[PDB]
From a paper:
The C-terminal core-domain functions as the oligomerization and protein interaction domain. It contains the PXXP motif (Residues 72–78) that recognizes SH3 domains of partner proteins and other interaction motifs at a 30-residue loop (Residues 149–178) distal to the PXXP motif.
The protein adopts the elusive closed tetrameric association in the structure. On the other hand, the N-terminal anchor domain is disordered in the full-length structure. Compared to the dimeric association of the earlier ‘open’ form, one subunit of the core-domain swings out with a relative rotation of about 174° and translation by ∼22 Å with respect to the respective center of masses. Further association with another symmetric pair leads to the formation of the tetramer. This leads to the steric shielding of the PXXP motif in the tetramer. The Arg105 of the earlier Nefcore structure is the first residue of the conserved XR motif, where X is either R or K. In the tetrameric association the Asp125 (Asp123 of Nefcore structure) now interacts with the second R residue of the XR motif. Thus the Nef tetramer can selectively abrogate the recognition of SH3 domains while allowing for interactions with other subsets of its repertoire of protein partners.
Author numbering: 74 to 149, 179 to 203
Write the structure that this text describes.
Amino acid sequence: VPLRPMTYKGAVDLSFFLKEKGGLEGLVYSQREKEILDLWVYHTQGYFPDWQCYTPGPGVRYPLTFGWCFKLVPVDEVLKWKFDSHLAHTHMARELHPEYF
């Protein structure tokens, strides 16, 4: 498909797709593993890969983009992808760090 920007509408439906149909959930996070993912999504769905960002360490990393419903939790610093459907409702990345926005 053609080329388009991530949108909340889109982000949400995506968050679903991946959860619902396959294993991102609980996947150890990594730089490349992210990146790969980006493109993948892109090739898959023509989203310009500039929307997959999370808040900085320590602890739980919150997706920057409102409506992308995955965060990165620690293991016991090591991060695993986790799905959470409330980040559809709460834009955590925002109260935590309104500076960027």
